[PDB]
Design a protein around this ligand. Structure first.
Ligand code: SF4
Length: 211
């Protein structure tokens, strides 16, 4: 096998977020563009100092064209308010920008499926473009896929959670904070979810206090 070009062929020579988001709908960097409605790019402006990265769009994100609009987005807004963070002062995006899903005989119309490492690596040039555009001071990695996208396939959020990290190789050398994805707070033991929500708030407060 070989290392793929992925999305790089499709990223234009621009740091403008609107031009990048329009170009991302034309991306064929992996197979996910085929069945998805549209690219789900980031939301926010280049003056943000804090960038947050999730895994991929969900069903409602794919329909709306923006990240974190489903129930996960409600929980994200709850956490952000608890951490004194204005959502529109952030740039929020996802490691993978087309909805990966399965249809099914019966049941839900579209069932989210985990992006493979190949798709995360293929879509990573868009992340690099976004970080070049926004020049964030701190990046919050919401969940295991977003964290692995910038920190390595073998990165474990449980090993480093809440730490303020630096990778050798991300534009602008922001501080990075790996934390829980808000969707994980929709399922699991109730008191573990409340503990993990508190910890998410802690990690967000830490990210916002990074100078
Ligand atoms: S997922 Fe990322 S890489 Fe695959 S097609 Fe959509 S934009 Fe291009």
């Amino acid at each position: 096998g070989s290392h793929m070009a992925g999305a790089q062929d499709f990223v234009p020579h621009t740091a403008d977020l609107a031009e990048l988001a329009a170009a991302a709908g034309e991306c064929r960097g992996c197979g996910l563009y085929r069945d998805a409605t549209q690219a789900v790019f980031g939301a926010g402006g280049r003056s943000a100092r804090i960038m947050m990265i999730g895994e991929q769009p969900g069903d409602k994100e794919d329909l709306a064209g923006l990240p974190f609009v489903g129930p996960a987005g409600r929980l994200l807004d709850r956490a952000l308010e608890a951490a004194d963070i204005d959502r529109d002062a952030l740039y929020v995006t996802n490691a993978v920008k087309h909805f990966k899903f399965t249809r099914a005989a019966g049941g839900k119309r579209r069932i989210e499926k985990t992006p493979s490492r190949t798709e995360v690596v293929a879509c990573r040039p868009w992340l690099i473009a976004e970080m070049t555009s926004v020049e964030p001071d701190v990046v919050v990695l919401l969940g295991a896929t977003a964290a692995k996208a910038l920190l390595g396939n073998d990165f474990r959020v449980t090993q480093h959670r809440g730490e303020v990290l630096h990778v050798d190789d991300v534009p602008g050398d922001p501080a990075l904070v790996a934390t829980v994805h808000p969707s994980s707070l929709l399922r699991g033991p109730k008191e573990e979810r409340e503990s993990a929500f508190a910890g998410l708030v802690d990690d967000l407060r830490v990210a916002a206090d990074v100078r």
